[PDB]
């Protein structure tokens, strides 16, 4: 019998397979002036890892 037992932990993060696929982009139209320097913002789906 096992009189001495020791254990270990592993927080295995499980990112989604469809994560960096069709990222949410609210800036579908980015019309601006010829000399405009507007930034662009986008976020990945589920915002996980990649």
């Amino acid at each position: 019998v096992a009189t001495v037992t020791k254990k270990a932990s592993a927080s295995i993060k499980i990112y989604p397979v469809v994560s960096q696929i069709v990222p949410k982009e609210s800036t579908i139209s980015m019309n601006f002036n010829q000399t405009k320097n507007l930034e662009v913002s986008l976020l990945p789906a589920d915002a996980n890892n990649t």
Partner: protein
């Protein structure tokens, strides 16, 4: 009618980000009078209605 000096669309992130933004020509006139009527005040026939082109 909304008036602003910033060249940013109403739906843009920099603007309020709501509603559709459309270009407006001329100044808004309160419904009741249209301006030039009579040299000595008698008053002409004004125009009314919204969106109506006259």
């Amino acid at each position: 009618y909304r008036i602003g000096s910033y060249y940013i669309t109403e739906e843009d992130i920099n603007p309020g980000d709501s509603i559709s933004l459309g270009f407006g020509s001329w100044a808004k006139v309160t419904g009741v009078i249209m301006g030039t009527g009579v040299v000595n005040p008698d008053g002409s026939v004004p125009n009314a209605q919204r969106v109506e082109f006259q």
